[PDB]
Amino acid sequence: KGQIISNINACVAVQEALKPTLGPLGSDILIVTSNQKTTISNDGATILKLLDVVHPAAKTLVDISRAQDAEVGDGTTSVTILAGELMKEAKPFLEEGISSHLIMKGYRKAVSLAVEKINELAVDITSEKSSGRELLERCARTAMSSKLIHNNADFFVKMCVDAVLSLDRNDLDDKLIGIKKIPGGAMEESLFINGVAFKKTFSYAGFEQQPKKFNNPKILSLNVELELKAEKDNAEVRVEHVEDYQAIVDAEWQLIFEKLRQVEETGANIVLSKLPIGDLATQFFADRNIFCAGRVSADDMNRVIQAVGGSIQSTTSDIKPEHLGTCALFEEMQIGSERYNLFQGCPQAKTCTLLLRGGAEQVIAEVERSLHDAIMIVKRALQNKLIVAGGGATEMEVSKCLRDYSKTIAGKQQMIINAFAKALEVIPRQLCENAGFDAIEILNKLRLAHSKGEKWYGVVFETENIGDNFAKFVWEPALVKINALNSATEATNLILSVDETITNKG
Amino acid sequence: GFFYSSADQRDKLAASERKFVDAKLKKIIDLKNEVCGMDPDKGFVIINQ
Amino acid sequence: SNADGQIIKSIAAIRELHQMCLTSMGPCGRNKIIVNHLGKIIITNDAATMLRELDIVHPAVKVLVMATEQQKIDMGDGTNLVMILAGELLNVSEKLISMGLSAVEIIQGYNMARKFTLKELDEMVVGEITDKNDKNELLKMIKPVISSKKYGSEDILSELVSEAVSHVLPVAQQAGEIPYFNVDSIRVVKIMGGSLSNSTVIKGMVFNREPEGHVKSLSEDKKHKVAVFTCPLDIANTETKGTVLLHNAQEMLDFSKGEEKQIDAMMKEIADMGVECIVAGAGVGELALHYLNRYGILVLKVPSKFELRRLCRVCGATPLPRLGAPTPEELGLVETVKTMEIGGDRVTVFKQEQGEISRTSTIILRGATQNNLDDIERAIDDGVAAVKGLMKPSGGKLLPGAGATEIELISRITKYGERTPGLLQLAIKQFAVAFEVVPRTLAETAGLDVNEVLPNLYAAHNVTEPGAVKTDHLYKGVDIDGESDEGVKDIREENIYDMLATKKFAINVATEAATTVLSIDQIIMAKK
């Protein structure tokens, strides 16, 4: 029993780090990786992946978070807090003589009865008392409330809804929507872009040309380097002739002219590559209205293939003519003392880009992540039509029903299910403490109307008070609440079933 | 050495060296049928270290 | 020296490790986490695997480890049972050592009680397995072997193993000389993602590698020609010498252009004979993948040489050490080759339908947790290993398990104690007490009280019947409870029993394991 108690404090230590990160208003944790890179995020997945804890039970809470992020992607913070809470409730039961096996058995019967109550609370509604456009707009204002963008949130919702509608509703992913930070400028002046945009890290010469107005530029991928410059290798050539000293400087310009001539016959007006483009080619492209941008990241080049349907070819010989693509309109903005490149009007584009503007780079970073929480609500609305009331609504009723069902159950399983129902109170607790509200007063006041027969009473995140989240427009999908109880119970059953921890050094 | 333009020509040259072993195997199998070949409860076992 | 209790120190060192194996057997038991030297957490129920990963310099522990390998290799069950029986014999022997009894009568007492126990095992068998190999009939023997691991999943996993065993065993009658089942012919695959209900039984070896080429799968025509090439794909060279070197730049043009004509010529001669599949155990060049796309030949690579030997008995292909000789006698035939999504990724499946019956089967498994897939994969190998014990040497006989037999044998052992005169009376009585540890651990791991299950088992198997023929039910075992109201229930209702070949063979191993420890009164080692 000594190692079992040691595993209890190991789960609380990991849980304590994720407590302030629960909720949109929750605090952020600072973790210093061995790479000496500063990483700050409130998402429990990335937090647990950077810890790399050697403890076996603490690693189990990290491994179960990856399964929550894979099959679902939402609730990685709450699944670990709920799983680790059972370790504290089962701590006094071990000293009293109650074995953890009957405790793990009571969880299987409690979750089985809880999943049935989730489907009863989930009501499918689409066109009833709601329109097509106003359905997704009201969901974006939920995550944007109680934020610095609340004044400008009117203009931000229009750009968020258009990002989801620009893609097929059958397949949606958060990684398909690109976001680029623009330092400086007003926040309300941000616009939405249908195509793909990159950072444009190219600082070299060749400005004042390639205007922002294009008609139908041709896009062609690039693999090797088009410039004749050789950075790495070299050779030694020396002659003893006096008059030959002139001609021995004059040669190499002809070497790549053979392969460069085939590029002109193609007529591609867009040149992009994962390698920096030499400054030699930055002139003649302006005569042919050809655009070129160097020092482009590798991740942004994958979106170009999915946009116009291009292809990456090694050389300039076998490039096929049908690999080219074109957009409807081009735009380039100099706001922020930096030129920004973006494509517009691509009907075949499988991705989009949303630009954000602000007063500082750290301010935009909080606005970008606050939008990601709203995107998941808008994305899962069209994917899954079964939603449940969140923000304390569903969490409190699951603990209420287990209190009545435990009265008919006899034996040790009565206090075990009641302990699991009491363990469900940590979720609304941390949400109130991280938002500034007192968790002691709300816990007593919320249980008042909670016994009146209505199961939809939530917790207001703006002004401290008890009420219904239906007016607050707080919606959560049913797949998250169901998989959270199964992932937390399975991870807890593995820790309590191991009495002895053995670690061999090698 | 083995000089072949195609893989089919290699089997003709490789079988030339294999005929030396197959020629001795023809004399071994004849000893089994020479003495009590068709007689029941008879066998022939090769040691071949 | 013996004055310091050296024989007790050898028992106390094992007694501290005895509680580890007491929680192994049974579905309600506990498992131990063992960190491998490679930096990976490995956990399993089977003790024979954990003892191999744990480094223990104690030779007294190695006696039970070597005895455990006898249960793991020769049998498919009893690895956790031999550790409990042999560990208890050392604890009950402390009462005889304290009284001043020599180790001779202790060893001789177990030898006399061993022949008395093995003789009574023939009368403990009521029903006999007919070896029908039916899907419903195999569920009786396989269920208790798959049990005591991942409790609650034994219902779904029972149909997966029972269906794979019927596919391996060929159809034959009245012939017991030639063996049929093979242990290594069943390979289990695991892929993260999915659920348990999506599992199925497929005849073949599932390949999780990418197709590597533009051809995902062949047609639906039966008897696809498959060629297995051991030598990697490269330009045709000479067996004698034939080393390519670089001297002058003029030879560089012949090296690049030479590999294009030679490889294309070798693939043309193979495609003319109708071979639609080429299996290369080694790496495949880049130029070889371009020619196979136009000829419509599926690309398949098998980097593991252990699967090449078992592949010859499935499709019928033979490995060729050379290259460019498509011998028709070395070519195999497979009816169906397709590509399906297993676990979320596109993989090429290898299976068949009717013709060319093969003994190789694969059970596809899916799940979210990676650690849970390791125990289920190892449970199938331990589940199919019991099929070998179903043969003529007492494969049909059975005895009730789950604590039913261990309690019933107590009444028979104590009866022979007063019948045999001499000093053996003390060893016979202690021989039956050592069997009480099995039902006690089942009650502790299930949360039941020690004072509850034990007196209920004795009162169930001991009754007063005015007659010679026994009545009521002798099948009462140790019930997990946690349901219904009170008491126990017949173990035969759930079709859970211990095979006699597993129990009878474990008695000889358990007695010889504790005999070596008790026979060694002194040990000498060096500091390490």
Curated annotation (Swiss-Prot), chain A:
It comes from the Eukaryota. Keywords: ATP-binding, Chaperone, Cytoplasm, Nucleotide-binding. GO terms for cellular component: chaperonin-containing T-complex; cytoplasm. The keyword Nucleotide-binding applies. InterPro entries: Chap_CCT_eta, Chaperone_TCP-1, Chaperonin_TCP-1_CS, Cpn60/GroEL/TCP-1, GroEL-like_apical_dom_sf, GROEL-like_equatorial_sf, TCP-1-like_intermed_sf, TCP-1_chaperonin. It is found in: Cytoplasm. The keyword Translocase does not apply. GO terms for molecular function: ATP binding; ATP hydrolysis activity; ATP-dependent protein folding chaperone; unfolded protein binding. PROSITE patterns: TCP1_2 (PS00751), TCP1_3 (PS00995). GO terms for biological process: chaperone mediated protein folding independent of cofactor; protein folding. Molecular chaperone; assists the folding of proteins upon ATP hydrolysis. Known to play a role, in vitro, in the folding of actin and tubulin. In yeast may play a role in mitotic spindle formation. NCBIfam families: chap_CCT_eta, thermosome_alpha, thermosome_beta. Heterooligomeric complex of about 850 to 900 kDa that forms two stacked rings, 12 to 16 nm in diameter. Belongs to the TCP-1 chaperonin family. This is T-complex protein 1 subunit eta. It comes from Saccharomyces cerevisiae (strain ATCC 204508 / S288c) (Baker's yeast). The gene is CCT7.
From Swiss-Prot, chain B:
It is found in: Cytoplasm. It comes from the Eukaryota. Belongs to the TCP-1 chaperonin family. Heterooligomeric complex of about 850 to 900 kDa that forms two stacked rings, 12 to 16 nm in diameter. Molecular chaperone; assists the folding of proteins upon ATP hydrolysis. Known to play a role, in vitro, in the folding of actin and tubulin. In yeast may play a role in mitotic spindle formation. This is T-complex protein 1 subunit zeta. The chain holds residues 250 to 298 of 546 of the full protein.
Swiss-Prot record, chain C:
One of its GO terms (molecular function) is ATP hydrolysis activity. Keywords: ATP-binding, Chaperone, Cytoplasm, Isopeptide bond, Nucleotide-binding, Phosphoprotein, Ubl conjugation. GO terms for biological process: chaperone mediated protein folding independent of cofactor; protein folding. GO terms for cellular component: chaperonin-containing T-complex; cytoplasm. The modification Phosphoserine is found at S484. Gene3D superfamilies: GroEL, GroEL-like equatorial domain, TCP-1-like chaperonin intermediate domain. It is found in: Cytoplasm. It comes from the Eukaryota. Pfam families: Cpn60_TCP1 (PF00118). NCBIfam families: chap_CCT_theta. Heterooligomeric complex of about 850 to 900 kDa that forms two stacked rings, 12 to 16 nm in diameter. Molecular chaperone; assists the folding of proteins upon ATP hydrolysis. Known to play a role, in vitro, in the folding of actin and tubulin. In yeast may play a role in mitotic spindle formation. Belongs to the TCP-1 chaperonin family. This is T-complex protein 1 subunit theta.
